[PDB]
Symmetry: D2
Subunit: 359 residues, 4 copies
C-alpha cells in the first residue's frame, strides 16, 4: 500500500506532454507530422518537438532518438512554480528517486522535477514553459484530421486499486472504472482538468505505457485519419476502431506509430469538474463497456504496450499481474460477455463478439 | 449463359422499394419505425408501408406479415407506363414466369409486373405510384439518424458472371467488382440511377437477398444509429461496421432486423452516370477492398442471407455456389489477404485481420 | 470601483442554471422542449425545470410563470457547502442585499444564497442539488439539434472595466476582450471552468441579460436548429448567425424565445484552464472579431436584452452606458470596420459589411 | 418563343466543365488551387485545367488567360459520339451559330460542338474526353474544404419563361422555380443528371453567368472554406452564406474569385431523376425561399454576374430585363417579404430581413 504523505500534494492542472524515445527519427517524423499533422515547435537531428492545433505551451510530444523505443517521461503541468517544490517534497517523502533541473530536461520547459513514481513510471512536474503561437484559428493550416489537444495518458499497471489510491492522494478523481462481481478491478480513469481523464490505469503487466491520446473537434476528423491511412496503404497500423467508447462516451481510434507506440484519437467526452461528479462502474462482462456498439476488442489492445524508462534511461523491469485478465474473462476460450445482463441472446462464450475468436 | 432478348429492355430508373415478409409485424414495426425512424405511409394488421425522408413515391419498404420471413419482391421503377409492357415481353422471351396486376400487388402501386427472374429473384417493375408528401424539408421530423433515400439492393447468387451479363443486357452498368487472378468473380455492383449501385451480386448459395440499403446525409447520422442501438441495448443487432468501403467508397453500417433481414446504411458514394464510367476491379485478397481500414469482415456477412419467394409465395430452392468462396480464400484455413500488394508485412495467412480468426 | 472584500471569495465551479420569468408557460414550453429538445426535470402549472443532455444536477433552466419576462436569477455552483457561507459573507461586505434560503429558492436546489450584486444582477450561489439521471449516453433520446451542456451567461453592463475587476476578484479570469486604441473596453469574457467563459460582459445599458448559452457536440447540430426553425416557419426568431466567432473561436447561433430572451447555441471553443492562459484582445474595428467570416452584426444584437429582477421580483432600473458604443463605432453613421488593418479594400464606412 | 426543332435533341448527361477567362493566371491559380484545393490536371503559361476530387474526365474547370474576364464556354457531356451530331443539327435548325472541332477546343476534350445558343450563351457539347486518375479515395490529398464534384451552372437571362421552354425541349426538367401571383417568373432550376440542377435560369439582364457550383461531401466542409478565408484575411470575398437554401434544400456558400466570377459551394440536395418528380414553386415574397433561415440576400447577388463570350471571343451585348426585378420586389424601397404567408409578424416592408 502506498502511504499518503504528510507533505501537501502539488496542484496538478492537466497532462501536458510525453517524451517518447523513438528508434528512427525520420520515420517517426513522417508519422506524426506528415500522416497526423502535428505542428513542429522545434526539431534537430536528435529530437522533434510537436504540438496540437490549440496548444500554447511549447509542446505536447517530444520524440527523442534513442536505442530502445520507450516512454521516457509523462509530464503534468502544475499550477504555480511553488508546486514543483511541493512535488519534490511529496515524492521524497514517498521514498522515490527524484531529479530536479532548474532549466528543464527538454527544450521549452523550465524548472522541472522527474521522479520514478511508486508504480515505476517516469513522471515529470513543471510550471515554466515557453509560450508559442496558439494555432487555434489557423484554418489555413487545419487538416481534415486535425489533432487539437493533448487529452490523456493511459498506463498499464498490475494492481489497479493500489495505483488508484496513490493517484487519489495526488488529487486525481476517479470518473469511471471496470470491475467484476467478485470484486476485481480491471481499469480506472481519473482526472484533474474536468474531462474523463488525464491519466488512467489499465490492469496488466507493468509499468508499461498503454497510449497517449489526442483529441479532435468532431467525429469526422477521426474518420478522416482512418481514410488517410487507407490511402497511404498503412491500414495495418490501425489497431482498433473507430468506435464509440462505453467508458468516457468518447468517439475513438487506436493507431500504432513506427515503434508500436499506441496513439488514441478521441473526441466528445463529458464534463467531470464538479466534486461530486457521479462515478460510473461497468461490469467487465458488459460487451458495451469498451466499444458501445459491441465491436470486439482486438487482443493486442490487452497484451501490447510500450516499455518505460527509469531516470538513467534504462528500461523498467516488468511485474506480472496476478489479478484476473480482462482479455481472458471476456474474449478468451473461457471468457464471456453479454449485451443485456442475464440474456443469453447477444451473449458470447469462449469467443469475441460479431463471430470472431482470438487469432 | 442467359441470351440477350430481341425484345427491347424496359427503361429502368432506379430501385424503388422492397417487400419483405416478416413474422411479427409489431416487432418489425418497432425496428423500422421506432429504432430506425422510417415514415409510415400506411399500415394495417397485415402490412406496414414505409418511406424515407426525401421520397415522394408511396413507399420504399413494405413489411408484410407471413409464416416464413423472406424477400417477396424487389421493385424497380421504370420510366413510362409502356416500360411495364416492355418488361413483360422481355422476361417472357427469357422464358420466365410473370404476373401482371393492373391495380398493383401492394397499396400505392398501380399497374405492376412481377417476374421470377433467371436467377430466381422476384423482381417487380412498375411506373404508376401514389405520390405522398415529400418530407425532405420537414426538419421538425428529422431524426439524428435519418434515412433519407432508398439506395440499393444486394443479391446472393452462385454464378456472378452469369447474372452480370443478364443485368448488363437489362441496362445495368457494372461500376465495381471483385475478382481474383484465376478467373473467378466474387461480387459485382451495377447501376441505373448514376450511383455505385441499384442492385448488386454477391457470390454465394442462392437465390437469397443479402441486404437492402438506405442512405443518410452524413457520416455522423450512421454513427448515431450505432449509438442509439447501444442505448437501446440491441448492439447485438449491429452485424458489421461502421466502416469505409473500398468498393463504393461509401461510409457504411450493417444491421439485422427481427427476422435477420440485413439492412445497410450508406452514404457518400460517387457519380457513375457517364456511360464509360471507369469500372474498378479489386483483387479478392486486398484487405482494403471491403473495409478500407482493413477491419475484418464478419463471417455471417458471407454466410447469412434472406430467403426469397417465388410468385406463389413459396421459398425458392437454393443452388450451391461451386466457384471459390470469398470467405474461404480470404479468412478461412487456406485464406490470404494483404495490405500492400507484394508485401509480407501486413499480410494475413489463414486468419482474419486485426488479430481475429473465424469462430 | 468595487472594493475587494477581505472575506474570502466563494470557490465557484461553473455557471449552473438560469431562472427566467416567462409570460406564457405553454408557449415557452413549446420553444424549450418541443423546438429545442431540453429534458424535463420537473413541471407543474407554474414552472418548468429543464436540463441538457449531459447534465447530472437537477436543472440548467427554470421557466417561471410571471407578469413581466425577465431574468430572475443566474446561478453558479460552488465547490462545497461552506462556500455558500463564504458567498454570504462576501456579498454582505460588498454592501449588497442578500437572501439565504436553507432549503433553496427553486426545486432541486438546497441551501442557496441570492444577491443583488454590485452591477444590479440577481446571482445565486449553491452547492446542494438533487442529482438526476445523466442522459449523456441516452442516444434513444438524442435530438438532431441536441443541447448537451449549459455553457455561459452574457451580461449587459455600462462600465466593462468596473465589472471585470469585480469578477476577477470573485476568481473569474479574463480570456478575451474587445478594445480600441483610445483605451475603451467594449466587452470581456471570463471563466472558472476552463472554457472561454462562464459569464461575460457586453458594454451597454444595464443591468440586462444578453443571453444564456448552451453547447452542442458538433456544428451540424447548430445547423439543424436553424433548419428546424425554418420548417416550423419561425425563422424570424433566428436573430444572428449561424457563424464562426472571432472571440472564442466557437461556432454559434442566436435565437429568441417567445418573450425575446436570447439563447445562444455554441460549440468548440478552446481550453483556458492554465493560469497563464494567453489573453486575446481584439480591436473593435476588426470586422472578423465577432463573426470571423465578416458577416454583419444586426443592430438588435447590440441594443436588445432582457430585464433583470431584484430579490422582490421587481424590474431593476437601467443605467445608460457613457463609454463609446460598439454599434456606433462599427456600423453607425460615423462608424467603420476593416477586413485587413490599414486596407480600404474590404473596409466599411458608415455601413455594415456585405 | 423559341421553336421546338424537328431534329432530335442530343442526349445530355450532365454539366461537365466551364471555361472561364481570367486576367491574372497566377492570382486565379492561388484562389482555385491554394485556397479552394482543386486538383491540377494540366497547366501551362496560358491555361490551368482543374478537376474535383471525384472526377475521372479530364477537367471540370479551365482557366484561360485573356484580356477580359468572362465565361467562354459552359460544357455538357452527351451520351454518345452521335449525340454531338444531334446537337449540331438541333442548333442549326434553331438558326444558331455553331462551330465544331474534331480535336476539341481545350486539352482533354475531343470532338466538340460550341454554339451561341438562343439566349446568347456559349454552350459546348462533347463525348470524347481524356480519362485521368479518379482521386475519390486519395484521402492523402483530401482538404478539410474538399470540392468533390462539379454540380451546376446558373445563368442570368431577362425572360425566364422563354429560356425555360427552350431548355425543356432540349430535355432538361424543371425541378423548382420562383414565381409571383401576377404571372412573373423570377428563376427556374432544371436538370439532366437527377439532382436539382445542371443549369438554372436567374431573371436579370443577360446573357451573364451567375455562378458555377461545386459540391462537398458534408456541411462542415463548407464551414471550413469560410474559416480558411477568415484565416487568410479574405473574408471580404465571401459574398453570401453559408446557409440552407429553400430552393434545392442544399447547404450553400457564395464566394468571389479574383475577377469576381462567383463560385457556389453546395451539398445535399435531393434526387430528381423520376420523370414525374414533383415540381416545387415558391412565391418570390417568401423570405425562406432562397435562404431557408430567412437571412437576407445581399443586393450584389442580384445585380452582379460575369460577362459571357460569343464564339469569336467577344463579349455578348447585355439585354435588359423588363419583367419585375426580384431585388426590387423583395428588398428594394417598395419591396415586401414574409416569414409566414398572411402574417404581418415577421414580414418586411421596403427592407431586407434581420434588421
Ligand atoms: O460575437 S463574439 O465573437 O464577440 C462572441 C463570442 C463568444 C460569445 O459567447 C458571444 O456571445 C459572442
Ligand atoms: Ca490466386
Ligand atoms: Cl476501451
Ligand atoms: Cl463490403
Ligand atoms: Cl438562392
Ligand atoms: Fe484512452
Ligand atoms: Fe451494399
Ligand atoms: Fe455567448
Ligand atoms: Fe446555384
Amino acid at each position: 500500500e502506498i502511504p499518503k504523505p504528510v507533505a501537501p500534494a502539488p496542484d496538478i492542472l492537466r497532462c501536458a506532454y510525453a517524451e517518447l524515445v523513438v528508434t528512427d527519427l525520420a520515420k517517426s517524423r513522417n508519422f506524426y507530422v506528415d500522416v497526423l499533422g502535428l505542428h513542429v515547435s522545434y526539431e534537430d537531428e536528435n529530437q522533434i518537438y510537436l504540438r496540437s492545433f490549440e496548444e500554447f505551451i511549447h509542446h505536447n510530444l517530444v520524440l527523442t532518438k534513442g536505442p530502445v523505443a520507450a516512454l521516457k517521461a509523462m509530464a503534468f503541468r502544475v499550477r504555480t512554480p511553488e508546486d514543483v517544490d511541493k512535488a519534490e517534497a511529496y515524492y521524497q517523502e514517498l521514498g522515490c528517486r527524484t531529479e530536479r533541473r532548474k532549466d528543464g530536461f527538454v527544450k521549452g520547459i523550465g524548472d522541472a522535477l522527474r521522479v520514478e513514481d511508486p508504480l515505476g513510471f517516469p513522471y515529470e512536474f513543471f510550471f515554466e514553459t515557453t509560450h508559442v503561437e496558439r494555432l487555434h484559428m489557423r484554418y489555413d493550416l487545419y487538416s481534415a484530421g486535425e489533432l487539437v489537444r493533448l487529452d490523456h495518458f493511459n498506463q498499464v499497471t498490475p494492481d489497479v486499486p493500489r495505483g488508484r489510491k496513490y493517484l487519489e492522494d495526488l488529487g486525481f478523481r476517479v470518473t469511471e472504472d471496470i470491475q467484476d462481481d467478485e470484486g476485481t478491478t480491471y481499469a480506472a480513469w481519473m482526472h484533474r482538468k474536468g474531462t474523463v481523464n488525464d491519466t488512467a490505469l489499465t490492469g496488466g503487466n507493468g509499468p508499461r505505457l498503454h497510449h497517449v491520446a489526442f483529441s479532435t473537434h468532431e467525429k469526422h476528423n477521426i474518420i478522416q485519419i482512418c481514410d488517410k491511412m487507407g490511402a497511404l496503404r498503412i491500414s495495418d497500423r490501425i489497431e482498433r476502431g473507430p468506435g464509440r467508447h462505453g467508458v468516457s462516451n468518447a468517439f475513438y481510434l487506436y493507431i500504432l506509430d513506427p515503434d508500436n507506440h499506441r496513439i488514441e484519437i478521441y473526441t466528445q467526452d463529458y464534463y467531470t469538474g464538479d466534486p461530486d461528479n457521479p462515478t460510473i462502474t461497468w461490469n467487465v462482462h458488459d460487451n458495451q463497456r469498451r466499444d458501445w456498439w459491441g465491436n470486439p476488442v482486438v487482443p493486442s489492445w490487452y497484451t501490447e504496450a510500450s516499455k518505460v524508462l527509469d531516470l538513467d534511461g534504462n528500461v523498467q523491469e516488468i511485474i506480472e499481474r496476478t489479478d484476473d485478465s480482462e482479455l481472458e474473462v471476456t474474449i478468451g476460450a473461457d471468457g464471456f460477455s453479454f449485451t443485456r445482463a442475464g440474456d443469453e441472446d447477444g451473449s458470447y462464450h469462449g469467443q469475441a463478439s460479431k463471430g470472431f475468436k482470438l487469432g
